[PDB]
Symmetry: D2
Subunit: 335 residues, 4 copies
Amino acid sequence: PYQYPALTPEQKKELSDIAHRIVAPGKGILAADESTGSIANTEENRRFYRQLLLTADDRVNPCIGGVILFHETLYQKADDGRPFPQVIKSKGGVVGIKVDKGVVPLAGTNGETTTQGLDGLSERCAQYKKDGADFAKWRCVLKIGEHTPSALAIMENANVLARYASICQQNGIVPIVEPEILPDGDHDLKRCQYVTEKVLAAVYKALSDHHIYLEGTLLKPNMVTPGHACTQKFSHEEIAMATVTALRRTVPPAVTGITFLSGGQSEEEASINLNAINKCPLLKPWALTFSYGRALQASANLKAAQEEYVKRALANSLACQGKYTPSLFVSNHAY
Amino acid sequence: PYQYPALTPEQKKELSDIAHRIVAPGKGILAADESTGSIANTEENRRFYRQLLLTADDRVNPCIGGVILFHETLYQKADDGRPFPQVIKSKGGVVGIKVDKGVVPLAGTNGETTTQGLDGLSERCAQYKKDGADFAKWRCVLKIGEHTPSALAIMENANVLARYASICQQNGIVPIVEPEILPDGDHDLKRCQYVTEKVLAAVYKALSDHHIYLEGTLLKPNMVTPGHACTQKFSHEEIAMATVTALRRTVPPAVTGITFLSGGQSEEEASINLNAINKCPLLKPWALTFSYGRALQASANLKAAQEEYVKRALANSLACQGKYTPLFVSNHAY
Amino acid sequence: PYQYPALTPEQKKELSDIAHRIVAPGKGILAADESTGSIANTEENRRFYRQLLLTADDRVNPCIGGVILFHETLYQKADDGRPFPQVIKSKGGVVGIKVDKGVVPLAGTNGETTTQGLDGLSERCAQYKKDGADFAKWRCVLKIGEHTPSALAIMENANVLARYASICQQNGIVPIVEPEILPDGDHDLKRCQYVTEKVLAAVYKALSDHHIYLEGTLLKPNMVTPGHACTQKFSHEEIAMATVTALRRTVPPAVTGITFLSGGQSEEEASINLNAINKCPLLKPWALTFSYGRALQASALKAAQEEYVKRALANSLACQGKYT
Amino acid sequence: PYQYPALTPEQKKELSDIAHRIVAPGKGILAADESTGSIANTEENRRFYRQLLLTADDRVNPCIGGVILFHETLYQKADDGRPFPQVIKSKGGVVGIKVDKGVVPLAGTNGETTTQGLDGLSERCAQYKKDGADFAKWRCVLKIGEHTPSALAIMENANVLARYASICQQNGIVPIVEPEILPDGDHDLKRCQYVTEKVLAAVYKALSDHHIYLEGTLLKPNMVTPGHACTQKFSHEEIAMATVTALRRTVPPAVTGITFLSGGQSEEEASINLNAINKCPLLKPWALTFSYGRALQASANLKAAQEEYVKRALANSLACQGKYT
């Protein structure tokens, strides 16, 4: 192996600085990047809704290190003329942009997918950087079943994530690597922990093969939870131990932060589990915070709605510090 | 591993049939798929030049089993109004379409590239199959150097080729897999053979990992030649033995045909080397024919130009049959 | 990738020549390398039974290109005073030696195994060569199940096979690569074909990765067949087509020959399937012959020898497509 | 991926506990596992040399968390008749055993090696455990050159280390994973950093593929240094930072400890660099201590030589806490 350095020290410093800004203590990410099809529905109601979240009062400023936007929102303005990226920065936030182009089927699999979006991505990134964005989001989707995720699905999704990260970093953009393992199915907590550990190991091997600068990245994994259709109830402390155990086994300390997606978890469930993860009594050498979409937005008449959002922002700000409130076989040796 | 079949029996039969039609004995491929930048320049002149090649007299019919078109040409028409895809089929040819969107650089490498174009590919393939295409081409480019091609370069290009092939086959399109090792640099014959063998082994492992149906594919490799800056001359017999040896070591017999690219070779070297390849006294369980662009078009006033092309197409139809003519030397030395 | 050549032209020619001798037209392999635990049981009875096969009448000579021996047998003598490797060679055979040291469990799997035996293997291979052997055999074992063979089991067995092949070829020994997929289970023909295809692709990627010279190797795979408890009926034609299709999709033409293991098949079944494989109307750019143990030995002094000669003769015809 | 668990909670507990004992605060490893060929020379002199080290003053007990032995020494006895493993345990140490059988050439490479010793290793581990050993060592060797370490050499050494690790853990033995990158050559600090990073990423991917329990393992890597013939000068602070950065990019936090090999460094250089490593300001979620042979033994008349070893033990005990002038 012979190095042709991907990044200069200045580019590295820029990327590490951004990543640390996003996940600073008490800060997490508003995921407002739903597509037109997802948000469903007119361009003005979309703009007004974004404006509602993005202009909530200043209690949110210390809670929100970053906001992920959809391409359209990135180019809209608030009522006062200010471009939404300027609104976010003026409140202490970093602007992010979703850059993938959705999932597509893998032939020869049981409905597994990879994600597309690499074509002309460098030129898109360079333009987004100019237009005020400093980090990006790309979502791969995996499913636990009898024979999934398959080796093909794991390899290909990890490979496309590494390509995406590489292109972003060449453009001054911090990549959020999102390998979402879906909660569908009847598998228990142990099986989710196992699959998560295998998927993340493949992701970090791929990132290394593609020469990624881990200090200028973030990870957006699922928490480790039973399948939606498992009927065994698991405690918040078990969810936290399994999640932190899987992360400790796979995620190098150099990764700057881990911004959990919420999945199907209610607003309060998502805050409680994030808090439990931060109280877990194992060494956790990275920020453990939130990148929540619906679990920050569901309770969010203009001013009432904003209060609902601020309340959840404040709650998760506390949870990502362990400060939130709403025998061998129980020890960490059982994970 | 647990199989979720990618293709039905009927889909497979369609792909294998198309693949065999393209490389039927005596037949090869005209690669007319140069982009606008490459072909350099008006659309009229581009259209006229392609009509010139596609409407040559009926003697090319038995020589050309397929033609690769650039996107714009798939939708153009000759002077009589016939769409170029109907002109090609009426002369016995299969219509192909280049689908990649060019190379891009890999960060952290010595200027190595991968190739883009997967986004929306499936929709484009279904459209092209509708407008008369039955196969496709996708080009990856590797370069030999002190530290290249790197493991990353080999892995990534083999992977994207496999993705492209999978998508095509879902849409009834035979993919031509083209992992081109450039002839640039000062490396000798043996070094080209070594790198070709390592690359193709990675290509076919990727095709297996992605569940590709090899009988419904073609391979478009470089011949094994010295680098352009190597001053040791190598004989036609040596180029043939190294090429066939590297292929025998990596390419499953299930593959229906191998359609060489010509690289920097002259029109005549390309025919001579193709012929020597077909005369090589080792077992070759696949068609060994041509997918030539410049090596069919350089020499090609309408009628004289059309005559230079016909001549080359005839020379290469003979060459892909071995019928052409204008210890250390043994196969254990390879 | 940068080459530091593993073999000289002289070394390649020696390996290619050995490999072509073993699988020359009409010839196959007698697999007589049953371990002492397997053959069960004294040393004299073992020597005598091995002598029974190796000294069979010279009508067997055009049928037998190679004989695979267990370590003990390589160092024994026939009644007439001659070392068994001398007996084999005088009948036109190449002498082969089993060099693996059995399977071991892979932790974290459902009863899956890899194979051990690499320690000291180069020194052993140099001695076996000196003592008359020109090819070797190493057996890996995979099992089709709900979650097997797993990625680990395929990768690890492909890697150990390639290590063994590398070491053999450094000592002038042709390696027979044996990735056996067991017939155990009720899976159908097509599942076996799919797994075989996936395993063989991994095998040949690994051989490439370890710089193996394929022209100086042989492959010993399972035929592609339904699982032992499968409830569906399948013709020889179908078994032949599935098998030849899997191989055409995975085995480079440079491989000199494919010497099938008989598995659980009867003497006559293995011959009929081998004949049908050779009649399959598809391009097959390698020798397709037999490396049979029980399928040559079961029905097998002069009367027993004759039954082995008859199966030798039958399989000699089958590996040419000429067996009624 | 479908799990067939390799270890029970009880097995995991035992392995984690052993691992944490070896690398507890202020503790490291005496690597006394030289083969008869390396330690070259009578059986009796070998026994006396190792006796000298193993029975040094109780002042070393807080410094030494484990001792790696060669097979021969595991079955020798001190002058008072005590098995050496009992001498080590009574001084508060964990007993280790070298179980590899040396390197072998990889054909088709530029003199690169892999390591052998897997045959019958499970049976060897179960017996060593019975005879008092609780951890093991296996050494792979890689070389930095114009075209090395090659992909084959990295993939193959990572795979054999994982096989080794799997077998040990099945037998209650904590595996020390030693992928040594040699300092030979004139490459710079960053080249060593880059290759170390690529190698460790392959090592941990392999351990994952083989279902290794990382909390029940230790890593024994080279520090990241310039090549022995490099013409550029580097400070201890730079060596520490390059080393810590390499490890942070590759080693999961679940790994219990990293016990450095001294690889050609002098007694004092190895202490200073270990101290600098422990003072590096970045987050370091594993123990960073020593697994030293010559760096603990070179200066080590019985009582005078024993004192030279005790002093190095004390120096490195401080250094693995960042507390050594």
